[PDB]
Design an enzyme around this catalytic site. Structure first.
Site, PDB file in Angstrom:
ATOM      1  N   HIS A   1      -3.519  -2.680   7.643  1.00  0.00           N
ATOM      2  CA  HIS A   1      -4.576  -2.981   6.661  1.00  0.00           C
ATOM      3  C   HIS A   1      -5.041  -1.666   6.054  1.00  0.00           C
ATOM      4  CE1 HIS A   1      -4.682  -6.940   8.393  1.00  0.00           C
ATOM      5  NE2 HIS A   1      -5.393  -6.619   9.459  1.00  0.00           N
ATOM      6  N   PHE A   2      -5.298  -1.665   4.747  1.00  0.00           N
ATOM      7  CA  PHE A   2      -5.930  -0.514   4.118  1.00  0.00           C
ATOM      8  C   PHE A   2      -7.417  -0.820   4.008  1.00  0.00           C
ATOM      9  CE2 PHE A   2      -7.432   2.393   1.017  1.00  0.00           C
ATOM     10  CZ  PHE A   2      -6.601   3.504   1.108  1.00  0.00           C
ATOM     11  N   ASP A   3      -8.255  -0.031   4.680  1.00  0.00           N
ATOM     12  CA  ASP A   3      -9.684  -0.352   4.740  1.00  0.00           C
ATOM     13  C   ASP A   3     -10.521   0.286   3.636  1.00  0.00           C
ATOM     14  OD1 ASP A   3     -11.371  -2.133   6.332  1.00  0.00           O
ATOM     15  OD2 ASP A   3     -12.492  -0.322   6.905  1.00  0.00           O
TER      16      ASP A   3
ATOM     17  N   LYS B   1      -4.821  -9.827  -7.577  1.00  0.00           N
ATOM     18  CA  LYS B   1      -5.491  -9.151  -6.466  1.00  0.00           C
ATOM     19  C   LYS B   1      -6.504  -8.181  -7.086  1.00  0.00           C
ATOM     20  CE  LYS B   1      -4.892  -6.779  -2.072  1.00  0.00           C
ATOM     21  NZ  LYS B   1      -3.981  -6.198  -1.053  1.00  0.00           N
TER      22      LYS B   1
ATOM     23  N   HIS C   1       0.752  -1.256   0.000  1.00  0.00           N
ATOM     24  CA  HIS C   1       0.000   0.000   0.000  1.00  0.00           C
ATOM     25  C   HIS C   1       0.785   1.312   0.000  1.00  0.00           C
ATOM     26  CE1 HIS C   1      -3.699  -2.270   0.259  1.00  0.00           C
ATOM     27  NE2 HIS C   1      -3.317  -2.844   1.389  1.00  0.00           N
TER      28      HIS C   1
END
Ligand SMILES: O=c1ccn([C@@H]2O[C@@H](CN3CCCC3)[C@H](O)[C@H]2O)c(=O)[nH]1
EC number: 4.6.1.18
Length: 124
Positions: free
Chosen positions: A119-121, A41, A12
């Protein structure tokens, strides 16, 4: 072995460019960051801000995560980001992506000591 923090950085973070401004960007980046080896992905975002600035988000606006956990944080300022979304005609191993540049508030999940993004939400 790759920590969750390191995995977030690999998946990210792209501080090297101010804004992803080639239509080729996602095709190249999804491959080079090893996000096209197991499968294509489907959706992935790269953030074009300093690591310090993204890490700082873990002390910013606390918001609910999409999965219902309480450890997500929204950036007070907009950030330069690039969304990569797999095209309808993309077929593994030739993963193909649409590259979309935006300035948006990011939402990340943070964990650990030190408390860092893992985590990228979402972006909003
Ligand atoms: O704006 C976004 C939204 C999602 N993602 C990516 O998809 C998330 C989970 N998705 C996979 C399927 C269940 C939810 C991953 O945590 C994140 O890597 C993103 O990068 N930018």
């Amino acid at each position: 072995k790759e920590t969750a923090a390191a995995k977030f950085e690999r998946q990210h973070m792209d501080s090297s460019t101010s804004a992803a401004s080639s239509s080729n960007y996602c095709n190249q980046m999804m491959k080079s960051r090893n996000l096209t080896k197991d499968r294509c992905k489907p959706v992935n975002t790269f953030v074009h801000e300093s690591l310090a600035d993204v890490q700082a988000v873990c002390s910013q606006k606390n918001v609910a995560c999409k999965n219902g956990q309480t450890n997500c944080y929204q950036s007070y300022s907009t950030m330069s980001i690039t969304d990569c979304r797999e095209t309808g005609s993309s077929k593994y191993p030739n993963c193909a992506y649409k590259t979309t540049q935006a300035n948006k508030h990011i939402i990340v999940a943070c964990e650990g000591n030190p408390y860092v993004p893992v985590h990228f939400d979402a972006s909003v």
